[PDB]
Amino acid sequence: DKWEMERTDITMKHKLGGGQYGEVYEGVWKKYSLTVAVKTLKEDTMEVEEFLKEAAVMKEIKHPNLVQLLGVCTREPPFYIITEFMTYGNLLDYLRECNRQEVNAVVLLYMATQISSAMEYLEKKNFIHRDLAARNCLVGENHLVKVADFGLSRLMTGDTYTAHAGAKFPIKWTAPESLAYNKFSIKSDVWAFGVLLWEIATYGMSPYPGIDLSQVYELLEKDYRMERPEGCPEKVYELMRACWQWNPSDRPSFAEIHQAFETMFQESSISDEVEK
């Protein structure tokens, strides 16, 4: 296997983001002076197969807006999955703490374009994402945004993936058919993407603010949808609302979504330069 490394090339430091990602540590790949992120797994565990599965998935996936695997150490008790280090952390915290004059309207469009690009790639590859949200997107330099591979699952048959029995997902990001039946399709991801667009537009506000979890499904079933946040362009809100169609088949594909954002991003860019 080309991906294998020797664990002593890595200098391990402290847990990233106060443990919000679980067992992921800042590390240094000594012979490149390169900071990295290192997912680790205790040796006393029953999750070895799942963890190797994550690695195998990471081997198959490659895209500029998906967090990149760098190497694994999987022949010795503490298993490692080493990924690139994203210096600005998760996108949700980034949006909340950022200078909004730097991270302005055009940057927001750019971030959405990047994520939609990643999702269109996954769509074509017959993958779905079980955890599409701002908190699971990572930010590097120059407003580079990548979706984390955590939550990625490949469809072996059909267009639906069923989450492990008893699974509990965050209600406010989850498509109603997924809440109801535990089925995730790429259309469920389109729903989640609409919510992510709302997280971006509001600089990291919680969705359905003030609304209690217990009411969300019924409210959605009865056509309740979040309103347009101030500052949000109408075309972006319309796309958001297209993502929140009750029937999965009425939602646009990520190909259509990415193309819409690419077009809007270009027009803003062109209009930006035209102003001198």
Ligand SMILES: CNC(=O)c1ccccc1Sc1ccc2c(/C=C/c3ccccn3)n[nH]c2c1
């Ligand atoms: C086991 N958990 C995961 O694999 C996971 C889940 C959600 C999102 C990501 C990951 S893996 C991961 C986590 C953090 C990172 C980072 C940087 C984290 C960070 C966080 C705060 C401040 C600065 N940096 N770079 N690359 C990463 C890869």
